[PDB]
Amino acid sequence: KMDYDFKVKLSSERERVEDLFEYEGCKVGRGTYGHVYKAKRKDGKDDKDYALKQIEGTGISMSACREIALLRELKHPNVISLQKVFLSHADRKVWLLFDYAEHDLWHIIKFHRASLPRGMVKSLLYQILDGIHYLHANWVLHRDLKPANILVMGEGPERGRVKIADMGFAVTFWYRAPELLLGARHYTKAIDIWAIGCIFAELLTSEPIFHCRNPYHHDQLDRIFNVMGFPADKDWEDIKKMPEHSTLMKDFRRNTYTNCSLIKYMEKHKVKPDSKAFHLLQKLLTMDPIKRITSEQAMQDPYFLEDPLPTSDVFAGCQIPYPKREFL
Amino acid sequence: KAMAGNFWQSSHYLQWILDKQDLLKERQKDLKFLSEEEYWKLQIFFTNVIQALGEHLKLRQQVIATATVYFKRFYARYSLKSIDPVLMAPTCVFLASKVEEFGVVSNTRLIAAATSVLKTRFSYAFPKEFPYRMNHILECEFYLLELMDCCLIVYHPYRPLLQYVQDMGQEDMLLPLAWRIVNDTYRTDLCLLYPPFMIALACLHVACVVQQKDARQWFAELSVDMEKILEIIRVILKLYEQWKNFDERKEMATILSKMPKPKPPP
Numbered sequence: 001k002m003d004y005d006f007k008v009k010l011s012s013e014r015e016r017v018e019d020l021f022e023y024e025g026c027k028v029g030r031g032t033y034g035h036v037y038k039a040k041r042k043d044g045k046d047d048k049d050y051a052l053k054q055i056e057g058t059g060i061s062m063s064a065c066r067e068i069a070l071l072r073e074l075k076h077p078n079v080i081s082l083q084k085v086f087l088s089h090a091d092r093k094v095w096l097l098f099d100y101a102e103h104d105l106w107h108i109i110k111f112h113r114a115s116l117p118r119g120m121v122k123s124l125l126y127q128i129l130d131g132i133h134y135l136h137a138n139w140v141l142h143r144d145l146k147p148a149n150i151l152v153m154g155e156g157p158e159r160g161r162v163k164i165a166d167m168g169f170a171v172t173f174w175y176r177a178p179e180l181l182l183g184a185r186h187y188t189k190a191i192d193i194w195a196i197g198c199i200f201a202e203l204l205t206s207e208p209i210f211h212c213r214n215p216y217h218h219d220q221l222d223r224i225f226n227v228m229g230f231p232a233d234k235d236w237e238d239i240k241k242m243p244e245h246s247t248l249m250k251d252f253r254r255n256t257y258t259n260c261s262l263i264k265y266m267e268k269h270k271v272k273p274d275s276k277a278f279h280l281l282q283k284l285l286t287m288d289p290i291k292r293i294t295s296e297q298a299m300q301d302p303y304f305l306e307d308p309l310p311t312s313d314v315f316a317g318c319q320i321p322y323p324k325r326e327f328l
Numbered sequence: 329k330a331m332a333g334n335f336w337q338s339s340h341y342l343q344w345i346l347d348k349q350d351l352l353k354e355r356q357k358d359l360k361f362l363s364e365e366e367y368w369k370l371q372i373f374f375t376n377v378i379q380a381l382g383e384h385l386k387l388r389q390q391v392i393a394t395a396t397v398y399f400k401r402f403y404a405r406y407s408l409k410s411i412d413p414v415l416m417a418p419t420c421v422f423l424a425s426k427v428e429e430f431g432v433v434s435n436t437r438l439i440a441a442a443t444s445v446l447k448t449r450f451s452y453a454f455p456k457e458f459p460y461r462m463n464h465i466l467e468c469e470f471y472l473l474e475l476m477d478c479c480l481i482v483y484h485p486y487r488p489l490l491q492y493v494q495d496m497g498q499e500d501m502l503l504p505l506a507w508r509i510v511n512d513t514y515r516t517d518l519c520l521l522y523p524p525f526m527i528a529l530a531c532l533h534v535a536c537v538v539q540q541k542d543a544r545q546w547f548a549e550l551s552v553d554m555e556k557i558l559e560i561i562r563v564i565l566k567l568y569e570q571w572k573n574f575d576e577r578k579e580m581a582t583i584l585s586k587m588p589k590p591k592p593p594p
């Protein structure tokens with residue numbers, strides 16, 4: 001029914017992922033979204049490392065169609081770039097070619113918590129904010145910001161540059177804004193910001209700030225109030241409008257968290273509350289979403305004008321101590 | 329809405345605003361079989377098929393517009409013999425609806441929609457029932473996505489038109505008509521040749537001329553190549569003369585019989 005000459009000609013010209021790239025046995029990731037391989041070019045024109053994602057499922061799924069639509073348009077140094085898309089007609093699989101990021105904040109933080117340079121924390125924070133700002137300006141929300149989705153480039157031209165990504169799940173609620181936990185129906189820019197504040201806290205202390213063992217999650221809220229304190233009416237007036245506000249009042253008493261505050265938590269982890277670092281962190285981790293700082297306002301904070309200045313390479317020219325990715 | 333303000337750095341702009349000369353050169357292979365007049369009548373016909381498919385499936389105008397652009401982009405490069413346009417139309421609707429976030433229209437529902445619109449609304453063009461099943465749609469979707477170089481986000485003149493009329497203070501007076509004229513511009517090549525805002529300005533100008541509204545000062549106060557907008561107004565005016573002189577229902581069966589036909593394997 002389709003024209004034969006047309007078919008055989010396109011089939012002849014079609015670049016096939018198995019012909020262009022060496023990747024068998026080099027699987028570095030597996031999750032909800034599908035498998036990610038560390039790939040090298042067979043025809044040795046580049047000789048640089050690439051990430052090959054095979055999208056879970058078959059054909060052009062809703063989710064496949066969304067990743068392609070967006071990533072085909074987005075262009076920013078601090079967001080993961082789509083290099084190429086392979087459609088495999090034989091098995092209906094879609095393959096996405098990304099540039100290879102050797103590191104990410106999950107492994108970097110885990111490596112430090114197992115045991116750096118002046119301004120690696122600040123630089124990481126700045127580049128994260130820069131990329132989220134770019135996405136937010138284009139009305140793209142991340143909706144699952146966490147250390148594992150903050151990639152960091154290894155040796156090469158983009159050494160130490162942060163790449164925001166969405167890797168899926170290999171779920172935990174440690175990075176989830178209190179409004180989501182109280183049943184908020186929609187994702188917002190402010191929800192991404194809270195997650196960036198949680199990452200910033202974790203970069204300063206090496207521990208997740210809200211670590212914890214349907215939309216309502218009691219223990220997760222217990223740990224937030226154990227760190228931040230229980231909010232006053234004045235601090236979050238629209239809390240009354242959250243669907244699970246009545247369950248919150250049923251289950252919790254302000255009195256329980258009377259000794260608790262972010263000042264006290266951070267002090268225990270040897271971060272001084274008179275520091276610009278802390279004063280920025282407090283604006284990111286504000287409980288009422290409308291009272292939360294925006295990504296652009298964060299970028300303009302005097303924290304980033306105080307010594308040391310943030311650098312393009314977050315490693316500041318230093319040798320990288322972290323191991324390469326293990327194959328699976 | 330995603331990428332709302334990104335036009336000037338978008339794939340639409342950087343890859344899918346074509347030169348007219350290149351377009352008409354690629355068109356010459358279908359002009360061995362069809363006249364120029366007949367090719368344009370074909371374009372109109374399939375703009376109405378897509379619209380009818382959209383309406384039946386209850387899709388918003390923006391989803392219908394994107395699907396119409398995908399179809400246009402495909403036959404801007406390739407011949408009508410390459411893939412049957414009767415298969416391509418509903419495939420474009422199927423893909424567009426996923427991108428613009430309506431949902432994956434179910435197999436049963438897409439095929440029943442295609443079958444039913446052709447039977448009830450286009451029997452003057454098609455004697456036989458819709459022959460394609462879903463395996464065919466799924467195949468065609470892969471070819472469509474490849475030809476478009478995975479460029480899915482499409483900008484249209486509806487949003488700028490809304491912004492322009494709001495600024496005028498003439499929403500109720502002009503928007504109904506100007507919005508209608510924008511629908512009609514998809515009967516032409518305009519979306520392949522001009523940035524969407526320029527098309528918006530041209531339609532709003534024609535709505536103003538038709539409704540005897542003086543908007544000369546407002547247009548003058550804009551910083552735009554007013555010559556480029558005159559070119560678009562001319563194509564809109566020419567289109568309504570083709571509409572008047574075109575009896576789609578007498579002519580299309582014969583025109584569709586003259587289309588070059590896809591060769592089968594040896």
Ligand SMILES: Cc1ccc(-n2nc(C(C)(C)C)cc2NC(N)=O)cc1
Binds near residue numbers: 053080141142164167
């Ligand atoms: C289904 C799906 C999966 C992943 C994405 N995605 N989104 C992003 C943003 C950070 C731009 C938001 C990145 C990705 N995918 C990826 N491999 O990085 C988008 C859609």
